[PDB]
């Protein structure tokens, strides 16, 4: 109608799409441009004009939470807290909501994942239902996409229905526009602690489902990724890069031509073989055309992008390649300067490799039209980012991830002060230590964490003392100071004994002893001042 036309011309995406659906060119192009338009930043990074991110989350009577409201950052949000505070619960809630987008991108009227009646309802909920309410943002044209997942407990006084239509409507736009003309699609992924798992060497190259674009959405929100799928896909890419398809077509074309000449020469016995070869040729051309038709990055380029991503983000890995050892295809890595198999990698290296490889695979598959497919949009959830990482790696992990995937919204959980030392306080959401499940609003810490000392973060943010309280020696310097202050700054028999104990235990060049020495010197000087003033 005229009203929809006005709103659509005003930049409203839903109105433009509704006009497209009713008339089924201009409206299609508007929708496509809304999704596809962007610019390259001063840093050379592609930036979509219309960003997609989760803005807000509300939990009512969900697991431990009676009521919780969270505002999320467009780029990076880190959730911190003690064990059992519900950090994982928050990520799971988001993942279930995202499942509704994924389901409807794949299939019209596809159903996402529902809340569990057994586990997701708070144990002492008076209303005996749970709600997960989420609000998404998609550019100025679609400032609010509200979604609610609801589940009622078993005793069932009244049914509370989920409200998922907005998710479906938006996902429909992606699906339908993509069907007509290929567009870049958002990546959704959850990496929970289940990402840590043993590598099966037995690479069952299935048939060829791993080459399909929407295999990128297969098991995206399952928590583990599919590192096996990566390996299969990567070997596939390698085999195709070593063998050009057009030469095979040219060779097949030549074979078909030679066989046709033989059939024309009176050898009717080879007619069956000619028909088979013509079929093979047609299939090869179709694959080539489909590849051509899909406007897709060449297999060589895809391989290179992923390899670069892995080597950039994973510090111990300088190179990754496919060997043809004996018969079977093996993925090899240069790890700490040595060529090894994936099964020879440490668990920490493998787990992190798996995360990055999986994510890169999905991004390459979902963003074929971008010069750099890793500059695509999406929302990625990572539980316990520091899982298996040495402190040195914890200092680099967030920087490396954000550099490699500049337009992904990362929502992460951590226990690591070292990780927090690399992040701005605005990105941090902390639970209060004494939270008995009634804290309405997660909040930013008071201290700036980025560039701060680890010891300060431990004390001021994580509420942990710099020295272990259950060790007697942890108290000695404090006690020594108290003794000095009690005896007007003079080193008495008791202070001397403790000093000697500190010296004996920690050593002559220990920090503790130097601090003790400092205390003696300052107290002596203070006393000298006091005497001069008294006289």
């Amino acid at each position: 109608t005229k009203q929809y036309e006005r709103k659509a011309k005003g930049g409203n995406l839903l109105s433009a799409f509704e006009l497209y659906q009713r008339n089924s060119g201009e409206w299609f192009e508007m929708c496509r441009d809304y999704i596809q338009d962007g610019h390259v930043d001063e840093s050379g990074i592609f930036r979509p004009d219309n960003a997609f991110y989760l803005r807000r989350l509300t939990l009512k009577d969900f697991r431990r939470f009676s009521l919780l409201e969270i505002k999320l950052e467009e780029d990076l949000t880190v959730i911190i807290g003690n064990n059992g505070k519900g950090k994982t619960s928050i990520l799971y809630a988001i993942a279930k909501t995202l499942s509704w987008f994924v389901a409807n991108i794949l299939k019209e009227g596809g159903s996402g994942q529902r809340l569990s009646e057994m586990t997701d309802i708070k144990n002492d909920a008076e209303d005996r239902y749970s709600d997960v309410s989420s609000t998404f943002f998609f550019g100025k044209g679609l400032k609010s996409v509200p979604i609610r997942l609801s589940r009622s407990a078993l005793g069932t006084a009244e049914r509370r229905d989920s409200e998922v239509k907005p998710a479906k409507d938006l996902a429909d736009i992606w699906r339908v526009i993509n069907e007509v003309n290929t567009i870049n699609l958002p990546t959704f992924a959850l990496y929970n602690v289940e990402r840590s798992q043993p590598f099966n060497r037995n690479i069952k190259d299935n048939t060829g489902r791993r080459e399909e674009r929407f295999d990128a959405y297969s098991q995206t929100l399952g928590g583990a990724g599919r590192f096996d799928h990566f390996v299969e896909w990567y070997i596939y890419l390698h085999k195709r890069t070593v063998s050009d398809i057009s030469s095979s077509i040219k060779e097949l074309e030549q074979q078909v031509n030679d066989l046709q000449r033989t059939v024309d020469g009176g050898m009717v016995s080879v007619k069956s073989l000619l028909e088979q070869m013509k079929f093979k040729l047609s299939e090869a051309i179709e694959r080539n055309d489909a590849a051509v038709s899909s406007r897709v990055l060449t297999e060589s380029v895809q391989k290179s992008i992923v390899e670069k991503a892995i080597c950039s983000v994973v510090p111990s890995i300088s190179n990754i390649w496919v060997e043809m050892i004996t018969g079977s295809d093996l993925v090899k890595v240069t790890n700490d300067g040595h060529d090894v198999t994936i099964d020879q990698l440490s668990d920490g290296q493998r787990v992190f490799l798996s995360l990055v490889a999986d994510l890169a695979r999905r991004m390459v598959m979902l963003n074929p039209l971008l010069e750099n497919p890793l500059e695509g949009r999406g929302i990625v959830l990572i539980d316990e980012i520091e899982l298996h990482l040495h402190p040195k790696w914890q200092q680099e992990v967030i920087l490396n991830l954000r550099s490699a995937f500049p337009n992904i919204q990362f929502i992460i959980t951590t226990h690591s002060p070292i990780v927090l030392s690399t992040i701005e306080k605005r990105c941090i959401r902390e639970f209060e230590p004494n939270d008995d499940g009634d804290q309405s609003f997660l909040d930013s810490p008071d201290m700036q964490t980025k560039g701060s000392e680890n010891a300060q973060i431990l004390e001021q943010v994580m509420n942990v003392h710099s020295t272990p309280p259950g060790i007697a020696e942890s108290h000695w310097l404090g006690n020594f100071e108290l003794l000095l202050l009690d005896n007007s700054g003079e080193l008495d028999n008791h202070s001397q004994v403790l000093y000697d104990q500190i010296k004996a235990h920690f050593g002559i060049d220990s920090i503790e002893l130097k601090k003790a020495d400092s205390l003696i010197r300052i107290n002596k000087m203070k006393n000298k001042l006091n005497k001069i003033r008294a006289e």
Binding site: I508, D509, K514, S518, I522, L529, I532, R533
Partner: protein, 210 residues
Amino acid sequence: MRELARLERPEILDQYIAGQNDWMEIDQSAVWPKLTEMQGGFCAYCECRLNRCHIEHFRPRGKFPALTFIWNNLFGSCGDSRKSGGWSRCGIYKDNGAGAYNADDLIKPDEENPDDYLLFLTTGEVVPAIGLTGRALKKAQETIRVFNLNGDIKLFGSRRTAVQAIMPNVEYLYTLLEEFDEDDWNEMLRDELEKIESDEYKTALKHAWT
């Protein structure tokens, strides 16, 4: 690093001659007491307390076999290859870790005063001193690089920790400039600088006090 007062040549270096003799032959317990007199049980290059230690040739024995049993070339460095591998500063790093270097553009602490070239910031870094250009800058920058005086985290961490421990005492003394008269205050600063001869990382502690 400190400016070191080299004094007298020990008697055992008279006997052994370059070409014929090797450093494996000479006794090392003969040489130490004069270096311990020179340096005061502290490293020549970083000023840690010596415990694992070795006699270091400033110009190495391979490249310069002339300066093998010469008293000016010898220094007490920290670290000891014989006991435990993987030491990453001073004598051991100059050989192994630091790649190519010109030996002429380094601070030899017996000859030169380090204080003109090096500055010790209380945040823990060693840097070139304010206003060096060309050649003097190159010596300062290469002494820092070749002895790994920042790049060793153990050293950097130990040095920062020590200076930061005394910075209450530095701020408190300079407040009492006003109330005290000059003879009282100059006696106090003399007394604090008296202590730090016996202390680890003395040049870094000196720059904090003065």
